[PDB]
Design a protein around this nucleic acid. Structure first.
Lengths: 333, 93, 82, 98
DNA sequence: ATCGGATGTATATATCTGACACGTGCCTGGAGACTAGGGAGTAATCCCCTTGGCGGTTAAAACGCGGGGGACAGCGCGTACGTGCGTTTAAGCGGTGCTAGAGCTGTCTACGACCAATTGAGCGGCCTCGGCACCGGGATTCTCGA
DNA sequence: TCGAGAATCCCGGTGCCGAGGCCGCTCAATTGGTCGTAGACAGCTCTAGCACCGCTTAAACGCACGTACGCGCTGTCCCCCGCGTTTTAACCGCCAAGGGGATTACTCCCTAGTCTCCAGGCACGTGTCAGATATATACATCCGAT
């Protein structure tokens, strides 16, 4: 539905705060900041020699946190492209995430170690707690306002901490239905409201409302707002994301390189988008204020927009025949 | 709890027919359940026919008739003959 | 502990194993879930009737003799369980 | 060069060995979970005998292989070696299961 | 695809009736009242099976992957089967007549019912050990390309 | 079609626990009176069955014949079999808690059993209309020409 030839080795992308720019990582380890309106590249940053697998914009948009595969995280000013700060860790980093309401702070999910929240002003770090002490794979994310931290382990356990004190404000383990746990693949939140989603190893996305987890307390049984899956193919989900408003949810079937689109309230599947059967789906993102969806597959990015009835359909356009309502004086002088 | 069965008589009649053979306790339980099944079958049928005959006394004639109703052909014939011989033996003393 | 969707826990390899036991060579896909349904429907009765026994038994655990008397009442009696 | 037996042949031998074997062909735990799921529909938190559930699964599988058997037979009367859902449905129909 | 004609079928009518609704006198099962025992109900106790979880394995399930095999659609023909009309034939009405056998009553008697006294056949429980199940390995035979 | 290869059969050996044998330990089987009674049996009816026979006729058997479904064959598609790989969770073994199942001991509410009386039910008459039947009629529908 529209691709870009000007970028190669697309690996990970991230919309800015207003959905005007897109920073995509490349295998060479370069940042390609490409613009939507001019439909061209806005910037090229020599980030790492190692490909970049995690990228996040700052709220003001002037900072981008990038993670190399060399366990090298670095902050870059979008105007200049300089490495503002640079750090390295053990257990290679799985993800970075700016704090949405404090760009000085940034959480980092490493591979084998617990996620740690650092600051840029001071090169300090706060190691977030781990429930089972043996997960070795815990994804973590700020909420919409950056007030709480949601951490999900490979054993389905879900901890909600407060971002400042790291104190356990809520907890619950998700189930595979019967009695078993499932590897929490990812935690996503809505940029609007409080609904969030969890991708798990059961190939079943679970949509909740964080207020219900907060009122559920520690070690409770919160039910999901929704349960979403491909009941037909039972396909895993490499990457999923909400819509900009938060009423549409998309999942990327890397198994068959497709895109499933459900709703939030009803949860019925909006639609499906099919990509090149030969392409391996890698990354998925939604335009924050547009029905536009960016996909990264086999190093190539594709764009999926959604237009209205007009752009040619605007006499007064009607859809179905209209019986004329004759009047009393319809034949009168 | 004193539970009653027939596996001992199963082993007995087995040796009576096959002295050099063993059984799975599973199979013994199966056979005993089968014993119970045929017993309830014949008993119910006998009571029902006696009810048709308005009889409150279930005797060997009822037994034979109900077996004939239940067993087919030579099975029934041999069973009738055997029961007849046995009741004759018991009545002989 | 609320259970669900164990019906598909029945593997198609299991179904085809049972079919081969029944002496079947070629099978279509449309059968299995259909099969499953029947399976469900079938057991749909007995357990209920079984626990019905347990109903009158005034007990919390369910026993074999329940399904024994069910299959009996279902005219599909079985041996080897008392 | 790789060898592959002709179709059915392997399945034919599977049939032969399954008529040879007698044990169950269903994994225990999935069947048990299914049974308990069905149970909670009529009443929740009910316990069971392992003997009881073994009986359930055995009797089921027996009914199931009988259904597969006579549906195979019907498909013979359908002159096909592939099975069709309608065969099973109409078999139940003759089995008074409709 | 329609119309015309043939034919078969739903309708109103008339009356005939024989089932059938209705009422009787007479019978006995049902109600009413009273006594006993003891099955059933309750409770405290024990056990102990079950339901729950935890970790390691792999055989098994999931999934994919050709691809020959047959499901199926179509197509020719032909034999077997509806049909309408012949034919002849037992089927049914019905009414007769005899009684063999159901079907009823009245004995009287053997025959379990039942209880009591007695106990050894049988059953829960405890060794025990040997066909049997498993395994590994060698030899046999089916099968798919010549 | 004679080999290669593959799944299988069989053989010897290993180790095991169920099959079995025996042992305490009854309660349920036996024995023997004893009693009221189920029915065995005799002995009557009467009626329903059983057969007789005639009369009418709707029904059955066969014919001829169109014809059209059954059947047989061809080619296609697709699709399910077979094998390879990857993932997983059934299983299995062990542990543990308790919650229900089973047990026993009381306790007594209810039912069986008895006796009394009669009133609803039942056999038995009795008018009587729902509907069976027949007829002419009006409507529906097939089948063939157009």
């Amino acid at each position: 539905d529209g691709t870009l030839d000007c970028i190669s080795m697309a690996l990970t992308c991230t919309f800015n705060r207003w959905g005007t720019l897109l920073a995509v990582g490349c295998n060479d380890g370069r940042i390609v900041i490409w613009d939507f309106l001019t439909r061209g590249i806005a910037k090229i940053i020599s980030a790492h020699i190692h490909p970049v697998c995690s990228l996040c914009w700052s709220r003001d948009g002037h900072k981008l946190v990038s993670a190399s595969t060399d366990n090298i995280v670095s902050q870059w000013d979008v105007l200049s492209g300089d490495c503002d700060q640079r750090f390295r860790f053990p257990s290679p980093i799985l993800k970075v995430q700016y704090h949405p309401r404090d760009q000085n702070k940034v959480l980092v999910c490493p591979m084998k170690s617990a996620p740690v929240m650092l600051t840029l002003s001071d090169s300090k770090h706060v190691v977030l707690p781990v429930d089972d002490d043996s997960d070795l794979n815990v994804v973590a994310s700020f909420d919409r306002r950056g007030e709480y931290i949601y951490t999900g382990n490979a054993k389905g356990k879900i901890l909600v901490l407060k971002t400042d004190s790291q104190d356990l404000v809520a907890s619950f383990r998700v189930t595979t239905g019967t009695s078993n746990t499932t590897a929490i693949k990812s935690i996503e939140f809505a940029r609007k409201g409080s609904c969030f989603l969890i991708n798990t190893a059961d190939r079943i996305i679970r949509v909740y409302d964080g207020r219900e987890i907060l009122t559920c307390g520690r070690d409770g049984e919160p039910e999901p707002m929704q349960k979403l899956q491909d009941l037909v193919n039972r396909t895993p989900w490499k990457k999923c994301c909400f819509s900009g408003d938060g009423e549409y949810i998309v999942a990327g079937s890397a198994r068959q390189h497709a895109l499933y689109i459900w709703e939030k309230s009803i949860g019925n599947l909006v639609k499906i988008l099919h990509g090149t059967r030969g392409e391996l789906l890698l990354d998925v993102a939604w335009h924050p204020v547009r029905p536009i969806i960016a996909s990264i597959s086999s190093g190539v990015v594709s764009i999926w927009a959604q237009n209205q009835v007009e752009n040619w359909s605007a006499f007064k356009e009607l859809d179905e025949n209209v019986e004329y309502e004759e009047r009393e004086s319809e034949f009168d002088i | 709890t004193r539970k009653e069965s027939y596996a001992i008589y199963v082993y007995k009649v087995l040796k009576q027919v096959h002295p050099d053979t063993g059984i799975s306790s599973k199979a013994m339980s199966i056979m005993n359940s089968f014993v119970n099944d045929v017993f309830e079958r014949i008993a119910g049928e006998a009571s029902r026919l006696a009810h048709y005959n308005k009889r409150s006394t279930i005797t060997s004639r009822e037994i034979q008739t109900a077996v004939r109703l239940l067993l087919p052909g030579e099975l029934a014939k041999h069973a009738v003959s055997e029961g007849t011989k046995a009741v004759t033996k018991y009545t002989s003393a | 502990k609320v259970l669900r969707d164990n019906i598909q826990g029945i593997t198609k390899p299991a179904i085809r194993r049972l079919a081969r036991r029944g002496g079947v060579k070629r099978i279509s896909g449309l059968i299995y879930e259909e099969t499953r349904g029947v399976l469900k429907v079938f057991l749909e009765n007995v357990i209920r009737d079984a626990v019905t026994y347990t109903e009158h038994a005034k007990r919390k655990t369910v026993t074999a003799m329940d399904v024994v008397y069910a299959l009996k009442r279902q005219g599909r009696t079985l041996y080897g369980f008392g | 060069k790789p060898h592959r037996y002709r179709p059915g042949t392997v399945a034919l031998r599977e049939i032969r060995r399954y008529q040879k074997s007698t044990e169950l062909l269903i994994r225990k735990l999935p069947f048990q979970r299914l049974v308990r799921e069905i149970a909670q529909d009529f009443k929740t938190d009910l316990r069971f005998q392992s003997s009881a559930v073994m009986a359930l699964q055995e009797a089921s599988e027996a009914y199931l292989v009988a259904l597969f058997e006579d549906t195979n037979l019907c498909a013979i009367h359908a002159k096909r070696v592939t099975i069709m859902p309608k065969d099973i449905q109409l078999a139940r129909r003759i089995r008074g299961e409709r």
